[PDB]
Curated annotation (Swiss-Prot), chain A:
GO terms for cellular component: cytosolic large ribosomal subunit. The keyword Iron-sulfur does not apply. It holds the Pfam family Ribosomal_L27. The keyword Transcription regulation does not apply. This is Large ribosomal subunit protein bL27. InterPro entries: Ribosomal_bL27, Ribosomal_bL27_CS. GO terms for biological process: translation.
UniProtKB/Swiss-Prot annotation, chain D:
The gene is rplE. HAMAP family: Ribosomal_uL5_B. GO terms for molecular function: rRNA binding; structural constituent of ribosome; tRNA binding. Part of the 50S ribosomal subunit; part of the 5S rRNA/L5/L18/L25 subcomplex. Contacts the 5S rRNA and the P site tRNA. Forms a bridge to the 30S subunit in the 70S ribosome. This is one of the proteins that bind and probably mediate the attachment of the 5S RNA into the large ribosomal subunit, where it forms part of the central protuberance. In the 70S ribosome it contacts protein S13 of the 30S subunit (bridge B1b), connecting the 2 subunits; this bridge is implicated in subunit movement. Contacts the P site tRNA; the 5S rRNA and some of its associated proteins might help stabilize positioning of ribosome-bound tRNAs. One of its GO terms (biological process) is translation. This is Large ribosomal subunit protein uL5. Keywords: Ribonucleoprotein, Ribosomal protein, RNA-binding, rRNA-binding, tRNA-binding. Gene3D superfamilies: 3.30.1440.10. One of its GO terms (cellular component) is ribonucleoprotein complex. The lineage of its organism: Bacteria, Bacillati, Actinomycetota, Actinomycetes, Mycobacteriales. Transmembrane segments: none annotated.
Swiss-Prot record, chain F:
Part of the 50S ribosomal subunit. GO terms for molecular function: rRNA binding; structural constituent of ribosome; tRNA binding. Disulfide bonds: none annotated. The keyword Nucleotidyltransferase does not apply. This is Large ribosomal subunit protein uL16. Pfam families: Ribosomal_L16. Residues 1-13 have a biased composition (Basic residues). Gene3D superfamilies: Ribosomal protein L10e/L16. GO terms for cellular component: cytosolic large ribosomal subunit. Transmembrane segments: none annotated. InterPro entries: Ribosomal_uL16, Ribosomal_uL16_bact-type, Ribosomal_uL16_CS, Ribosomal_uL16_dom, Ribosomal_uL16_sf. CDD domains: Ribosomal_L16_L10e.
Length: 79, 75, 192, 182, 126, 136
RNA sequence: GUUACGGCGGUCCAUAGCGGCAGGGAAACGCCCGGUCCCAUCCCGAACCCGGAAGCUAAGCCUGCCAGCGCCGAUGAUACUACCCAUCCGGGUGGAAAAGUAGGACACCGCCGAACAC
């Protein structure tokens, strides 16, 4: 007379965190993710948990490189 | 192939013991598997192997009820 | 094939959108579209009673001699947009036509059938794809089934045509299947 | 500075005859044997892991090269078969060693099979690759036929750049395989 | 009406080369102050370039086709060596000291390696 | 009886009864069809009753197609049990039926008998429905 | 500058693919000859590597052709929907698909090198 279900796992707060256009510093986290849904491009690095981060400051551009959505960083214009 | 050596490789003379239509050629057959009589068939000398049987001594594609008899036999 | 291409007064539209289109259907018109190798997609309003008379008369694929803006034009009905419940006509695509063109067409067969007693028919398909001339599309591919017996698979490459008309659906098709007729005890063992 | 029998013969007569038969534009289209293949499925890998070594030794003595040991990539337990159990040995032969092997096979052993009527013309596939099989190794004088503890048959297959079975059979005829001429 | 069956080894070798070259290229980069040294080999002769992959442009070039390089007599290796000399000179004229080395989808050793080692000897930083 | 041989998930939500048909709004394989007008869940036993109603009204020969199959279960839970403590087990199987959708298609020659049969099969179902000819 | 050339790259990566037809080999891309030397096979100079240019453009590759297998793809309408009106129903302003259709398309672009030339 039991429901043997009921369990669940607390969240991990995944997804995009710095969308198109924004200004990001270095080492900042663009997206947390399990697999490489989004891949790195230029001035972008990968983590251990397939997190992404910035290697050079600038601003974002979610473009594709041969069918795969990438993330990039572009040079800000110095004031 | 290369070290981790294979069997040894030496020539061979397969002497036709059927009708004397012999063969002779390089091979991987030697210390491994050879016979005496180093007979030179050519400018050099190398082992020989008696050939008990071969093609020209083996009838095959390459080499070479009845009632009319019953009442032949039964008269 | 002495067709009388039906004539219709159509006026171009001011407003192109859902509200305008519903108001039009309500008033008693039907929006419509015209294109082809005209390369100038025109947006029209026809009158539904007249359009329905035209269709009921000369089948669905039925050439038209339109009157746009005082100017006249020539069109063919390529596609209809029908409602399921009400069975209105919500919208109509119209392919411009010069005379003497080869456009592909999809018409309906007609089973004129009186069979043997131990016989039943099964219409696996209604619609067959054709190329023909502009003014010369049929309305009814008459297929006759009389004197025939149990199984006689009427293939598609067996129908009689006009002169200058071509079959383009593959000739593999079963347009008809003449089944060995059922038993009252076979009707218990179908879908249980 | 050397030539095997079948290869000298190949470059002398057989290319000519196939040209005069099939009339190719380029001679590059001429059919030519590439390699020769040997395999032995032990099959009792789960019952004798030592017949494998036996077969290795036999093929060593036979072909003059240490074989390859083919592992079982899948595990099908209806045969005891598990991922990595050695089931068979395999050898590739290319070049003068190949031509010498065919010379020996055609001239010593295949004229030593018991009641050899003929190898079929129907062991081909798609274009002319001849895949036959031997029940025992009691035939090669290469082998020490005193020491064998069991029959360990094998399976041979001969691959060629021929494009169809007609060209394959014709080439192998010119090279002297005893087909059943039919 | 004769017709073939399948893959020739020319096609195999070609597409495998492209396969492993664009495998390797993941790690190699391009820049006008650190360009990529591509090599493109054949049996007979050889070609090389200095590439900027930021714009897919090219800064230097050399090959064993030019008569001045055919004026070598020695082995294929020596042709390659003099090629490395020429590209060192040209690169250091056009204003490049440091580079990477892309083996272009070929194995290191032989003509490739002797080229590159001659270049390392004659000044380029890699 | 109509049931599937196996479903992956044998405890499903209740289907939706929102929207009009997308497919099955056109008679396909016969001549004289049935068309729904409302939203409803139609079960196994209803369709059995209806096909039998038709076969006992033509009685000899003439074919019947059923363009529906009960591939979505529902869960009763046993009696006199307070709410809570889980989700009941599947007991009967429905197909959702959106308006415009076609259920049955007959092929019998005479329209008299055919229309009558379809009416007898309509009065075995929970929905308002109507009868269709293949024509426009 | 330029031709039916080769090589490195790019496109928010099939508009670029697959298959069929014809056609080309000057220098180059190739295939091919052979394992002396570096080097290599879980066995095999098959591959990788080395040394050369007898032979052939047959294949790879490049060029044109075929919209056929695949892809791309609108306008307008519809579904759905935000907001508002509305005693159930339904409706108005704006947004707007998928599919389908008309059609498109046997790719485009950049750099160096060759050959060719004033």
């Amino acid at each position: 007379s039991s429901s043997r279900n009921g369990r669940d796992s607390a969240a991990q707060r995944l997804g995009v965190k710095r969308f198109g256009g924004q200004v990001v510093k270095a080492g900042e986290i663009l997206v947390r993710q399990r697999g490489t849904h989004f891949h790195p491009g230029v001035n972008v690095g990968r983590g251990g948990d397939d997190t992404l981060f910035a290697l050079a400051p600038g601003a974002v551009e979610f473009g594709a490189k041969r069918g795969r959505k990438t993330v990039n960083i572009v040079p800000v214009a110095r004031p | 192939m290369k070290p981790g050596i294979h069997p040894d490789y030496h020539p061979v003379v397969f002497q036709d013991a059927a009708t004397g239509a012999q063969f002779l050629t390089r091979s991987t057959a030697t210390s491994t598997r050879t016979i005496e009589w180093p007979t030179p068939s050519g400018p050099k000398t190398y082992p020989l192997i008696v050939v008990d049987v071969t093609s020209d001594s083996h009838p095959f594609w390459t080499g070479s009820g009845q009632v009319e008899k019953f009442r032949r036999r039964y008269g | 094939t002495a067709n009388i291409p039906n004539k219709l007064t159509a006026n171009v539209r001011t407003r192109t959108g859902k509200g305008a289109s519903r108001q039009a259907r309500r008033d008693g018109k039907v929006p419509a579209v015209l294109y082809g190798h005209g390369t100038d997609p025109q947006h029209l309003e026809l009158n539904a009673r007249d359009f329905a008379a035209v269709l009921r008369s000369h089948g669905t694929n039925a050439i038209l001699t339109l009157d746009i803006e005082g100017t006249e034009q020539l069109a063919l009905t390529k596609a209809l947009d029908v409602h399921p419940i009400r069975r209105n006509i919500q919208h109509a695509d119209l392919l411009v036509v010069q005379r003497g063109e080869k456009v592909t067409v999809e018409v309906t067969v007609l089973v004129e059938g009186d069979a043997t007693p131990g016989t039943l028919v099964t219409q696996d398909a209604n619609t067959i794809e054709i190329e023909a001339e502009a003014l010369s599309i049929p309305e009814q591919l008459t297929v006759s089934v009389e004197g025939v017996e149990a199984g006689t698979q009427i293939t598609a490459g067996q129908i009689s045509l006009p002169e200058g008309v071509n079959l383009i659906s593959d000739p593999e098709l079963l347009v008809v299947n003449v089944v060995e007729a059922p038993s009252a005890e076979a009707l218990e063992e179908e879908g249980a | 500075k050397a030539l095997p029998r079948l290869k000298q013969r190949y470059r002398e007569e057989i290319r000519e005859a196939l040209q005069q038969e099939f009339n190719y534009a380029n001679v590059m289209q001429i059919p030519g044997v590439v390699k020769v293949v040997v395999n032995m499925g032990v099959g009792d890998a789960a019952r004798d892991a030592k017949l494998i070594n036996g077969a290795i030794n036999d093929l060593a003595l036979i072909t003059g090269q240490k074989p390859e040991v083919r592992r079982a990539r899948k595990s099908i337990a209806q045969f005891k078969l598990r991922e990595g159990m050695p089931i068979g040995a395999r050898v590739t032969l290319r070049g003068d060693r190949m031509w010498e092997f065919l010379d020996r096979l055609i001239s010593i052993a295949l004229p030593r099979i018991r009641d050899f009527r003929g190898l079929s013309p129907k062991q081909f596939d798609g274009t002319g690759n001849y895949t036959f099989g031997l029940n025992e190794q009691s035939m090669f004088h290469e082998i020490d036929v005193d020491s064998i503890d069991r029959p360990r048959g094998m399976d041979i297959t001969v691959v060629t750049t021929a494009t169809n079975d007609a060209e394959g059979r014709a080439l192998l005829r010119a090279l002297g395989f005893p087909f059943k001429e039919n | 009406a004769h017709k073939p069956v399948g893959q020739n080894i020319s096609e195999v070798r070609r597409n495998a080369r492209l396969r492993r070259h664009a495998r390797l290229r993941k790690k190699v980069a391009g820049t006008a102050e650190v360009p990529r040294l591509v090599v493109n080999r054949s049996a007979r002769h050889i070609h090389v370039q200095l590439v900027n992959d930021l714009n897919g442009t090219t800064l230097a070039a050399a090959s064993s086709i030019e008569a001045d390089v055919r004026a070598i007599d020695g082995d294929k290796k020596a042709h390659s060596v003099r090629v490395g000399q020429l590209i060192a000179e040209r690169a250091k004229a056009a204003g490049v000291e440091t580079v990477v080395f892309d083996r272009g989808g070929y194995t290191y050793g032989g003509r490739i390696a002797a080229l590159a080692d001659a270049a390392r000897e004659a000044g380029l930083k890699f | 009886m109509l049931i599937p041989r196996k479903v992956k998930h044998r405890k499903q939500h209740h289907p939706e009864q929102r929207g009009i048909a997308s497919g099955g709004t056109s008679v396909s394989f016969g001549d004289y069809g049935i068309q729904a007008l409302e939203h409803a869940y139609i079960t196994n036993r209803q369709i059995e009753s209806a096909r039998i109603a038709i076969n006992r009204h033509i009685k000899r020969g003439g074919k019947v197609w059923i363009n529906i199959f009960p591939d979505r279960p529902l869960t009763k839970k046993p009696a006199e049990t307070r709410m809570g403590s889980g989700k009941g087990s599947p007991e009967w199987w429905v197909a959702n039926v959106k308006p415009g959708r076609v259920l049955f298609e007959l092929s019998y020659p005479d329209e008299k008998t055919a229309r009558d049969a379809l009416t007898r099969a309509i009065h075995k179902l929970p929905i308002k429905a109507r009868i269709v000819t293949r024509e426009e």
